[PDB]
Amino acid sequence: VLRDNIQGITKPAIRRLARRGGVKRISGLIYEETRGVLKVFLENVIRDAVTYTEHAKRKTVTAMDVVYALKRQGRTLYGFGG
Amino acid sequence: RDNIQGITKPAIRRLARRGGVKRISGLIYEETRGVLKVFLENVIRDAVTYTEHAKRKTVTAMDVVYALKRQGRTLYGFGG
Amino acid sequence: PHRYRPGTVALREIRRYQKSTELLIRKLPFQRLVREIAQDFKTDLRFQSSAVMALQEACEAYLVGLFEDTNLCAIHAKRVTIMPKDIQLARRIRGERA
Amino acid sequence: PHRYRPGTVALREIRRYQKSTELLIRKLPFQRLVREIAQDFKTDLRFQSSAVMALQEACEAYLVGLFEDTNLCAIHAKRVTIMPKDIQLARRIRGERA
Amino acid sequence: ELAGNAARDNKKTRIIPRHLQLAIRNDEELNKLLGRVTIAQGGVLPNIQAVLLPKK
DNA sequence: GTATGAAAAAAAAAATCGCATCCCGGTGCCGAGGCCGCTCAATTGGTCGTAGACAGCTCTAGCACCGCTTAAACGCACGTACGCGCTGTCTACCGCGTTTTAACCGCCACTAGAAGCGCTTACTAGTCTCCAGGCACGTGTGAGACCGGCACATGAAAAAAAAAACGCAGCGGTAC
DNA sequence: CGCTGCGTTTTTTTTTTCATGTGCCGGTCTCACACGTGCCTGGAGACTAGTAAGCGCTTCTAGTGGCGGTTAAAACGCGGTAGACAGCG
Ligand SMILES: [Ca+2]
Ligand SMILES: [K+]
Ligand SMILES: [K+]
């Protein structure tokens, strides 16, 4: 019902990420640039994940699909069934 | 010996030129010599591990291919 | 009137968030995104709550990783503000793009 | 006499070496280095001519690819010269050093 | 071994991920080994670049 | 006396000049392209056995609401410190021409070690039966977060006090 | 008129308060670690058997010197220019 959710990654949330980043000062143009890179990254992982879901004739995406996806993408996550 | 200096200034400049580098600080030359040595050391290590495990006293192209593939620097046109 | 000088809170804000580990994106928003993005690949999907969370951990870790690479590029150009050009440069040297 | 202005020989030295593929390090120097570095991990080793050339074909590919990244960093600093603090930034973002 | 000391320092009895993060990232070898490994609920080692600090 | 006008210099666009890079053939040599007959690895065909397709059944866990509560997001406002462009100094990095060196050739002769071929043994996969390790349930007690009260080092402000442009006044000098 | 210094008014810099977020102490409540119990499956035992692999011997390749010769390539150095770094708005 809200077809453009990329926005829900709110400026403050991105600021905080950037803080953990160790960033002191943030150009305004960033947020959108970030939102975009986020979108790509999620898009890429979730594609591979759903591939894995679909390959197992499941209608439900599992935590393991997301790990198999993150491992392929070279982006390996510990603590969900690794 | 110390064959690292055998990677003359003009050869590094040559590589940089393929790299599309217009201007080259004098420091670079020795730095490059450092990074190169790390790279050879690392590849050769794993290469010679692959040799030793086959028990050969001769290092093959396939040793070096296997290494490069491990090291994430896959090579075409020497086998494998 | 009492106010802190530009980039003083910012620095506190760093120390705060570097000491902690909690996800910094409000969870519902993030979840909604993920499903919006799942539509692009298969209609009427469903997600294990742990899957959604396994993504957010991944994304948040990536972004925080980028901004560190990003932030060293800003600093490389004797700056302190991070700018799209910096991310662009970082992704470039990473291999995320041409 | 006549002489070309600082840079215009370089630009050519680029065009030349991009359009070509000959290996740009002297073959024998390199090979001595390889055996120097190999004695570390085991003495009285033997190499197939090809196996040396496989290494030399990589080292050169790598260094070339590095300088490319290096150069984009130097340029990021509104410079044209490459310097060590450009290599190091590339290699950090690449993930070769900490 | 290293993470268990992490949890002392922090005055905690149970090991949490963050102790694992602080354990791994602070050891050079383990960190080479876990180079491409995200550690859920692990966060980042405190680091602030010098140029960003105030001069006084 | 005064508006005026042509020299200096600056900046710029064009034509020697020469310099290095592409196209035209002609020369030759070497490596790709292709056949030869030999070897094993692909196929043919049949049987034995299991992996997985299938339809149910079970219950999980994923969805989706209700409806307070609050925290976080959002949205303004005022100002500061950072980004950014413009300049001008100096030095370091390019360009070109001596002098030095060592690589790349096309030979040499010699040996290891690679790489293949056999024969022998000890090492695995493969049955089955039999325990116990290990996991999915249900219980409980304690670490740890959470809350709120502390001194507490702090950077931001407020309160004095050691300098740089501003008046304004005293005074010397100098032509007239 | 022009200068010159010297009391003024402001600016810069110092010293002391001061309002803030810190991380620091010690009492309550929660649900997550840890235990445990009982059941079941997957490891162990042991013996069978068939084949992989390791060692020695057979050959012959392809790797390691080594020998000069010529040349292209490095070396080195000098000379100047444009680009790196600081400083101003
Ligand atoms: Ca508190
Ligand atoms: K379910
Ligand atoms: K051989």
From Swiss-Prot, chain B:
The gene is H4C1. GO terms for biological process: chromatin organization; negative regulation of megakaryocyte differentiation; nucleosome assembly; protein localization to CENP-A containing chromatin; telomere organization. The modification N6-succinyllysine is found at K9, K55, K57, K69. This is Histone H4. There is a cross-link at K69 (Glycyl lysine isopeptide (Lys-Gly) (interchain with G-Cter in ubiquitin)). One of its GO terms (cellular component) is extracellular exosome. The modification N6-(beta-hydroxybutyryl)lysine is found at K9, K55, K69. It is linked to Tessadori-Bicknell-Van Haaften neurodevelopmental syndrome 1: An autosomal dominant disorder with onset in infancy, characterized by poor overall growth, microcephaly, hypotonia, profound global developmental delay, impaired intellectual development, poor or absent speech, and characteristic dysmorphic facial features, including hypertelorism and abnormal nose. Other variable neurologic and systemic features may also occur. Changing R23C: In TEBIVANED3. The chain holds residues 24 to 103 of 103 of the full protein. GO terms for molecular function: DNA binding; protein heterodimerization activity; RNA binding; structural constituent of chromatin. It is found in: Nucleus; Chromosome. The modification N6-propionyllysine is found at K9, K22, K55, K57, K69. The modification Phosphothreonine is found at T58. The nucleosome is a histone octamer containing two molecules each of H2A, H2B, H3 and H4 assembled in one H3-H4 heterotetramer and two H2A-H2B heterodimers. The octamer wraps approximately 147 bp of DNA. Found in a co-chaperone complex with DNJC9, MCM2 and histone H3.3-H4 dimers. Within the complex, interacts with DNJC9 (via C-terminus); the interaction is direct. Interacts with NASP; NASP is a histone chaperone that stabilizes and maintains a soluble pool of Histone H3-H4 dimers. The modification N6-acetyllysine is found at K9, K69. Belongs to the histone H4 family. The modification Phosphotyrosine is found at Y29, Y66. Keywords: Acetylation, Chromosomal rearrangement, Chromosome, Citrullination, Disease variant, DNA-binding, Hydroxylation, Intellectual disability, Isopeptide bond, Methylation, Nucleosome core, Nucleus, Phosphoprotein, Ubl conjugation. There is a cross-link at K9 (Glycyl lysine isopeptide (Lys-Gly) (interchain with G-Cter in UFM1)). The modification N6-butyryllysine is found at K9, K22, K55, K57, K69.
UniProtKB/Swiss-Prot annotation, chains C, D:
One of its GO terms (cellular component) is extracellular region. The modification N6-(2-hydroxyisobutyryl)lysine is found at K19, K27, K42, K85. Its main location: nucleus. The modification N6,N6,N6-trimethyllysine is found at K19, K42. It comes from the Eukaryota. The modification N6-(beta-hydroxybutyryl)lysine is found at K19, K42, K85. GO terms for biological process: chromatin organization; epigenetic regulation of gene expression; gene expression; nucleosome assembly; telomere organization. Belongs to the histone H3 family. This is Histone H3.1. It comes from Homo sapiens (Human). The lineage of its organism: Eukaryota, Metazoa, Chordata, Craniata, Vertebrata.
Swiss-Prot record, chain E:
The modification N6-(2-hydroxyisobutyryl)lysine is found at K11, K12, K32, K55. The modification N6-crotonyllysine is found at K55, K56. Monoubiquitination of Lys-56 (H2AK119Ub) by RING1, TRIM37 and RNF2/RING2 complex gives a specific tag for epigenetic transcriptional repression and participates in X chromosome inactivation of female mammals. It is involved in the initiation of both imprinted and random X inactivation. Ubiquitinated H2A is enriched in inactive X chromosome chromatin. Ubiquitination of H2A functions downstream of methylation of 'Lys-27' of histone H3 (H3K27me). H2AK119Ub by RNF2/RING2 can also be induced by ultraviolet and may be involved in DNA repair. The modification N6-succinyllysine is found at K32. The modification N5-methylglutamine is found at Q41. The modification N6-(beta-hydroxybutyryl)lysine is found at K32, K55. The modification N6-glutaryllysine is found at K32, K55, K56. There is a cross-link at K56 (Glycyl lysine isopeptide (Lys-Gly) (interchain with G-Cter in ubiquitin)). It is found in: Nucleus; Chromosome. The nucleosome is a histone octamer containing two molecules each of H2A, H2B, H3 and H4 assembled in one H3-H4 heterotetramer and two H2A-H2B heterodimers. The octamer wraps approximately 147 bp of DNA. Belongs to the histone H2A family. Core component of nucleosome. Nucleosomes wrap and compact DNA into chromatin, limiting DNA accessibility to the cellular machineries which require DNA as a template. Histones thereby play a central role in transcription regulation, DNA repair, DNA replication and chromosomal stability. DNA accessibility is regulated via a complex set of post-translational modifications of histones, also called histone code, and nucleosome remodeling. This is Histone H2A type 1-B/E. It comes from Homo sapiens. The lineage of its organism: Eukaryota, Metazoa, Chordata, Craniata, Vertebrata. The gene is H2AC4.
